Amino acid sequence: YKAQTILEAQGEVARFAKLLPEYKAAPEITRERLYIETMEKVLGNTRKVLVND
Amino acid sequence: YKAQTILEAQGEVARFAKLLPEYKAAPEITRERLYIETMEKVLGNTRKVLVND
Amino acid sequence: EAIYNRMRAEREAVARRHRSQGQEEAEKLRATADYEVTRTLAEAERQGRIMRGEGDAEAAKLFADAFSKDPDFYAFIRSLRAYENSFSGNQDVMVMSPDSDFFRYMKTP
Amino acid sequence: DAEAAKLFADAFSKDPDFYAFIRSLRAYENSFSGNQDVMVMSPDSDFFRYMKTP
């Protein structure tokens, strides 16, 4: 468990470090694209009901 | 997975780059057509209730 | 007969002790083997995560520039694609109104 | 766990807001992955702002 969690932490750190400069270059577009992808995934996974309030 | 992701990103970039000048020439008509098609599909894929509020 | 039972019980005791010692040794060896297997798999998974992150960043660069070419139209197209993908399933229920702007032509002139 | 926490802090101290955004998005993806819940949105919601006519 210790070895696996340390290695996974290193991998996640590397991924975030690589991804950060690209976002820093163009923040708005990356934010919008990631948000849309996450929302389409989550909405596809769950049942939905659209009613006005 | 890395190679496939890069290839798909290149494909989507090419498609959007080709399609954008067509939109820029006549925005209203193409926007309306795309909107109508998307609503047609989404409403055809779900149940509808048209109760007034 | 009682003496025979006692000696048989003692011999069974010795045999059970020997088998238990063997099983303990086997369990220890299997445990260390499983630890080594898990460590190797974790190292490979870390390298794979690094590769996936590199690919995602490379794709993000192209998406960012080509879509900063025109942000609003990309937002429109991507939102429409997201709507289609999310509502593709038929497990949901949608409630509308005849006053909604999409059905503005449902009402006759 | 202490070593992993040190690594995560040293990495994400560069930009906390972006890390929060990414981690929350992944949490939303992971939690809702099971098709057992029900969501109730509205057509006026900001995500569904492009479902209205131009």
UniProtKB/TrEMBL annotation, chain D:
It comes from the Bacteria. Signal peptide: none annotated. It is found in: Membrane. Belongs to the band 7/mec-2 family. HflC subfamily. HflC and HflK help govern the stability of phage lambda cII protein, and thereby control the lysogenization frequency of phage lambda. HflKC inhibits the SecY-degrading activity of FtsH, possibly helping quality control of integral membrane proteins. This is Modulator of FtsH protease HflC. It comes from Escherichia coli. The gene is hflC.
